[PDB]
């Protein structure tokens, strides 16, 4: 769900950046309410995420080549030998059905090599399950002697916004998703709107990203009146302030001049102490899934020489307790923890 | 001293506008804890019907299966609940889905080419190019296919665009619509938005008559501040029409001559429906859920 | 891609108002603001939903591996 | 009266890819040192 920015420099159109949207316009409230948002952590609305807000997909392609001059491995299935329920993922040709759900261990293709006289399969292995988007057979680098050995398989990995994923405004204010807060528990505006994204007010005094503050009242003014605003640098002056410009626009529309909104608590239901700073800010979802190195080991495999847990997250590997952690355990005088 | 009969004496309801989709009603002399409770229930706890299990047979469209399945779930169905029983999750799929627990919606669209003189319109250039919510055909099955005879399953908004196609592409699916609550997923929330706003209070401390009264009148929306004459003071005609923009406070001539507050007891609710139930039905069920929640705890053993 | 079903913030159905919006801009020759008002979008959250929609699906569809040329 | 976004213009160009000169010349001007550099390898004066 790509969206055109309300607040934008006119050069955005000059480069036709609308052909490739990089973000989405979100209702962002500068509020400290949940308690889970603080400095490097921001809150995303549950009901917004449920409605497809900031949803993304990731495509991965694999080349299955049979080269390792006489042809031995052939795409498909060998006669007389057939291990149980493989036909569920692959078609008669040995290639997978485009659209099929696959998990690590499932067969991604099938072949038969005469050297071993057995029907073997190339397994799919990744922590993230996928769906087959594209299967292309390529039989090149030959004049008359044609036979397929090379196949390109594209995987579609669906990526919903998860707790840990980074989100940022166009002002360098990045934060990890601390929680997907429910709309009933979310603070609700006088208008009846609950913010899509919650940014903590304690982020701004150190970063000094006032561009985001003027972007908030500009985006709101442009959403109401239905007009895009120019946010090209040095357009405004000390005499002609944007806070006054969009402030006048906000007052004319029927909202507070200083970009504030009377909001009510989602828990108590009572009106909050003061009017909360709410607006429309163009947010970007960063491609990284930070919890990729998430692991747990009780008793897994060990190396023959040291007889110590082997290295490898996916291999049920061990966490290293290095010299510094050794030093720290000596530090506490905690000899049994070291042991 | 507060009695439940003493609450009946002061509690008032005022209906400003009651349309087929949205109702604007007031709850006078009630606590925030009760008004917020109904609000929370109307969004999260009032059960509704939405697609949950989309079974794809073919999808040659540009729109990915996951995305297309998610869009169907988001489409509100003009289906009254209570007609459906709650599905049990522990028993298997063959016992799980029945004529009492599930509603089936099929989508079978194939795109082709049409001969027309050529910018040319997609409805002219191709046949079945745009897939709409109205293309979700209702398929009644089992023991009861006569209960939905005078009540056909049709999406609340039919002109909702579901998919866009080019000749050669096809969509073939069987969607299983079930009963669920808004707390689980936003697709099950029967309300478009159920929110309340406290009655704005404008405490005029000084008479502020004259030309300053005309200046004070422009600080609030047109139908809020009314002036009798040049004198006879400056009164508040309809404090309910106020947007609470605090525009009056950002002027030295009024910053100390007026106070902006609220009526904590008075709530202005605005409930819009997705299309399945009427806004009144959604509010009534919200009060019925809060009562049932307190009733279930009443007739319950207090263990340990 | 296509117009989203329901407004991300409140949940008001917006998917049926995309083709109707372009008709109000083309045939009716109205401004962006007035067109959204006639569709029944008064909250700025519902307003930006359609106003800010790109509709890359029309660009995406021009690549069809099922039809020649 | 404003510095608006092209909505009607955008959607028309999405359906109709121009058959004349491409829109956004600055985008082609961005890759001008790359294409131009390789172009001078065969075309231009002195062969």
């Amino acid at each position: 769900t790509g969206q055109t920015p309300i607040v934008k420099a006119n050069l955005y159109d000059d480069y036709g950046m609308d052909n490739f949207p990089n973000g989405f316009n979100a209702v962002v409230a500068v509020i400290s309410y949940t308690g889970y948002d603080m400095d490097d952590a921001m809150i995303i609305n549950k009901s917004a995420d449920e409605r497809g807000f900031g949803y993304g997909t990731m495509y991965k392609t694999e080349k299955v080549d049979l080269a390792l001059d006489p042809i031995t491995q052939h795409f498909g299935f060998g006669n007389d030998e057939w291990p149980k329920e493989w036909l569920e993922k692959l078609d008669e040709d040995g290639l997978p059905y485009i659209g099929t759900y696959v998990e690590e261990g499932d067969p991604i293709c099938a072949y038969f090599d005469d050297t071993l006289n057995k029907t073997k399969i190339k397994t799919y292995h990744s922590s993230e399950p996928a769906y087959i988007e594209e299967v292309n057979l390529i039989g090149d680098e030959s004049n008359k002697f044609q036979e397929l050995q090379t196949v390109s398989i594209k995987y579609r990995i669906r990526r919903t916004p998860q707790i840990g994923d980074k989100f940022s405004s166009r002002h360098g204010q990045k934060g990890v998703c601390s929680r997907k807060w429910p709309t009933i528990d979310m603070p609700f505006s006088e208008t009846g709107i609950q913010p899509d994204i919650i940014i903590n007010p304690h982020a701004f005094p150190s970063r000094m990203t006032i561009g985001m503050f003027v972007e908030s009242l500009a985006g709101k003014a442009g959403a109401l009146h239905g007009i895009a605003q120019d946010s090209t640098p040095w357009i405004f002056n000390e005499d002609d302030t944007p806070a006054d410009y969009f402030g006048e626009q906000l007052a004319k529309a029927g909202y507070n001049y200083h970009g504030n909104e009377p909001m009510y608590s989602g828990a108590t239901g009572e009106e909050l102490r003061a009017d909360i700073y709410v607006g429309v800010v163009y947010y970007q979802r960063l491609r990284h899934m930070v919890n990729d190195k998430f692991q747990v080991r009780s008793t897994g495999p060990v190396n023959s020489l040291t007889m110590q847990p082997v290295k490898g997250r996916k291999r049920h590997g061990g966490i290293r307790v290095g010299e510094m952690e050794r030093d720290a355990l000596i530090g506490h005088g905690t000899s049994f923890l070291l042991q | 001293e507060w009695n439940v009969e003493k609450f009946k004496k002061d509690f008032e309801v005022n209906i400003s506008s009651l349309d087929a989709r949205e109702a604007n009603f007031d709850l006078i002399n009630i606590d925030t804890s009760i008004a917020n409770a109904f609000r929370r229930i109307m969004i999260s706890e009032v059960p509704s019907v939405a697609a949950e299990y989309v079974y794809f047979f073919n999808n040659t469209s540009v729109i990915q299966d996951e995305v297309l399945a998610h869009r169907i779930g988001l489409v509100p169905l003009k289906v009254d609940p209570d007609m459906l029983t709650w599905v049990d999750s522990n028993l298997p799929d063959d016992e799980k889905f029945t004529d009492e627990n599930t509603i089936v919606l099929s989508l079978n669209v194939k795109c082709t080419r049409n001969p027309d003189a050529p910018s040319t319109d997609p409805k002219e250039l191709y046949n079945n190019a745009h897939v709409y919510a109205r293309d979700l055909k209702f398929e009644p099955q089992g023991r009861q296919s006569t209960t939905f005879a005078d009540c056909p399953v049709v999406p609340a908004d039919p002109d909702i665009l579901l998919a866009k196609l080019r000749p050669g592409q096809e969509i073939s699916l069987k969607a299983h619509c079930i009963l669920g609550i808004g707390g689980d997923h936003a697709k099950f929330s029967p309300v478009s938005t159920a929110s309340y706003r406290l009655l704005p209070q404008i405490n005029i401390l000084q008479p502020i008559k004259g030309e300053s009264a005309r200046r004070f009148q422009k600080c609030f929306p047109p139908g809020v501040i009314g002036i009798d004459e040049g004198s006879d003071e400056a009164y508040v005609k309809d404090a309910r029409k106020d947007t609470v923009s605090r525009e009056v406070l950002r002027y030295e001539e009024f910053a100390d001559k007026v106070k902006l507050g609220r009526v904590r007891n008075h709530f202005i609710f605005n409930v819009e429906s997705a299309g399945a139930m009427t806004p009144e039905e959604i509010f009534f069920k919200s009060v019925r859920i809060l009562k049932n929640k307190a009733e279930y705890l009443k007739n319950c053993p207090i263990t340990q | 891609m296509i117009v989203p079903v329901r407004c991300f913030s409140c949940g008001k159905v917006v998917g049926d108002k995309w083709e109707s919006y372009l008709n109000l801009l083309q045939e009716d020759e109205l401004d962006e603001g007035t067109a959204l008002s006639r569709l029944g979008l008064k909250r700025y959250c519902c307003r930006r939903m359609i106003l800010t929609h790109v509709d890359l699906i029309e660009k995406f569809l021009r690549y069809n591996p099922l039809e020649k040329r | 009266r404003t510095a608006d976004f092209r909505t009607l213009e955008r959607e028309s160009r999405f359906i109709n890819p121009p058959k004349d000169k491409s829109a956004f010349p600055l985008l082609q001007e961005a890759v001008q040192p790359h294409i131009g550099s390789f172009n001078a390898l065969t075309e231009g004066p002195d062969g």
Binding site: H225, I235, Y245, A253 | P221, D242, T243 | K42 | -
Partner: peptide
């Protein structure tokens, strides 16, 4: 230096919950 041009004919487009654009 020329000031940023203000937008032509800006009207009220936000009112109370159960109140429309009836007031002119």
């Amino acid at each position: 230096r020329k000031d940023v041009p203000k937008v032509e004919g800006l009207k009220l487009e936000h009112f109370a919950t159960g109140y429309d654009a009836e007031d002119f």
